[PDB]
């Protein structure tokens, strides 16, 4: 049915302090391999 009376974004009431970082850790398996500049750091 159609509903325009309730607020469907109730998920963020249950987010903890590690929600963002656990989501990033979950996303880490999906991602493309990073490019490299050829050195370990600009001080190398």
């Amino acid at each position: 049915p159609f509903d325009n009376t309730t607020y469907k974004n109730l998920q963020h009431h249950d987010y903890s302090t590690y929600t963002f970082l656990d989501l990033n850790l979950d996303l880490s398996k999906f991602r493309m391999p990073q490019p490299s500049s050829g050195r370990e750091s600009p001080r190398h």
């Binding site: 500049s37 050829g38 050195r39 600009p42 001080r43 190398h44």
Partner: protein
């Protein structure tokens, strides 16, 4: 750099000693404060040779042309990145 524009003729420094009364810098050198100013090197050399002063000449040292780039502070792969700004 406005003091690096002209040529100067100075002399060798002689003895400055302590005045026994006041501790002032007593000298016996009349040419101690004599600094002459010339537009070119050759004017100074002609003036030194004209007055019989044995001279020695240092060459003008300019700063060499530098290669500057503000984007070089943020290179992808070079060591010339800045780590702070």
């Amino acid at each position: 750099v406005n003091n690096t524009k002209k040529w100067k003729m100075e002399f060798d420094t002689r003895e400055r000693w302590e005045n026994p009364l006041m501790g002032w810098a007593s000298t016996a050198d009349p040419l101690s404060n004599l600094v002459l100013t010339f537009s070119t090197k050759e004017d100074a050399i002609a003036f030194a040779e004209k007055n019989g002063w044995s001279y020695d000449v240092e060459e003008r040292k300019v700063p060499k042309p530098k290669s500057k780039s503000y984007g070089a502070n943020f290179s992808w792969n070079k060591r010339t990145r800045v780590s702070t700004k």
